[PDB]
Design a protein around this ligand. Structure first.
Ligand SMILES: [Zn+2]
Ligand SMILES: [Zn+2]
Lengths: 39, 160
């Protein structure tokens, strides 16, 4: 379940929303809802 | 299926690559003209020339699918990741306008240039891919024919 450090959509660093089904951690801005903590 | 013909002016795309990434800049994305205002131009450009019912039906289907397709792709896989925080900036200004009417045709041609690598992920038949790539390359040619008022002329060196 070890989420890899770098981004799952571009390769950057920072805090990303974890995923359990896959260790994919996309940037909070690199989703396709473009969202800040709103939702 | 594998190939397009990007005419040797869109020297622009790779420049688009540099500024956003190295020579740090940005595109503020309330835009006029928008994508939807140019498809509906080229359509009206070419559809006056198609002869049979087959041609006009397939052209209409492709164009409607293209506005909707740019809509559904523009968010998740069409931005350089520096126009990403700014995408969040713009997503709060207009909440009641579809993404197919805020960007000029400079992201659309990114779609045009990366389309074949996406049709090499689906099991289309030869005539689907043939007519599709024919239409989008004709669109690229029409765009280089009129790039006066369509492409931007400056970049917005913006804060993070
Ligand atoms: Zn995943
Ligand atoms: Zn990211």
């Amino acid at each position: 379940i070890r989420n890899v450090d770098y981004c799952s959509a571009c390769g950057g660093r920072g805090l990303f929303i974890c995923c359990e089904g896959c260790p994919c951690s996309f940037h909070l801005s690199c989703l396709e809802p473009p969202l800040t903590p709103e939702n | 299926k594998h190939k397009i013909s990007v005419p040797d002016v869109l020297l622009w795309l790779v420049d688009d690559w540099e500024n956003i990434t190295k020579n740090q800049q940005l595109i503020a994305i309330p835009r006029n003209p928008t994508v939807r205002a140019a498809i509906a131009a080229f359509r009206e450009s070419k559809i006056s020339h198609l002869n049979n019912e087959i041609d006009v039906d397939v052209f209409e289907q492709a164009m409607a699918g293209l506005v909707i397709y740019f809509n559904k792709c523009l968010g998740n896989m069409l931005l350089y990741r520096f126009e990403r925080q700014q995408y969040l900036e713009i997503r709060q200004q207009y909440p009641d306008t579809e993404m197919c009417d805020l960007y000029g045709v400079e992201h659309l041609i990114r779609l045009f240039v990366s389309l074949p690598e996406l049709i090499d992920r689906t099991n289309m038949d030869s005539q689907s891919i043939e007519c599709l790539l024919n239409y989008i390359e004709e669109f690229l040619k029409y765009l280089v024919l009129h790039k006066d008022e369509y492409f931007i002329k400056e970049y917005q060196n913006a804060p993070p």
